[PDB]
Amino acid sequence: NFNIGSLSDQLSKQTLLISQLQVGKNRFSFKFEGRVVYKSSTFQNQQDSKYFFITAQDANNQEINMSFWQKVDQSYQTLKVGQYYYFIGGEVKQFKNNLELKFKFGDYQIIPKETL
């Protein structure tokens, strides 16, 4: 499994704005801070994998889409519209000419700011 780090290690990672994200950026080299503005229903693909989407706003009021894949029940309830989170382990991914952050079960951490 991956060594995401202790909670202290996770918060130690550099916070990046949407404008600072690039495809291929090392997934354990940064954290993303965002306020949830939208949370989709859960969906399911032909391989039985469940997934859902959120839209998050960064400190500069820019917005980005994020997608969460597999074992969604373990993460779905913690994400609430209007609340702030740190996300660690996201893949910066291109779709068309656009960027999203993709989170696959096994690779990531969510730290709610309300726990801080």
Any descriptors?
monomer; OB fold (Dihydrolipoamide Acetyltransferase, E2P); 9 strands; 9% helix; Telomeric repeat-binding subunit 1
The count of strands amounts to: 9
Largest sheet: 9 strands, mixed
Structural class: mainly beta
Report the helical percentage.
under 10%
CATH class: Mainly Beta
Count, helices: 2
Shape, please?
globular
Q: What's the number of domains?
A: 1
| CATH architecture annotation | Beta Barrel
* CATH H-level homologous superfamily name: Nucleic acid-binding proteins
Report the β-strand fraction as a percent range: 35-45%
The rounded Rg comes to 13 Å
The H-and-E topology, N to C, reads as HEEEEEHEEEE
CATH T-level fold name: OB fold (Dihydrolipoamide Acetyltransferase, E2P)
Query: CA-to-CA gap between the ends?
Result: 26 Å
Subcellular location: Chromosome, Telomere
Family: Belongs to the replication factor A protein 1 family.
Organism: Tetrahymena thermophila (strain SB210)
DNA-binding region: 31-103
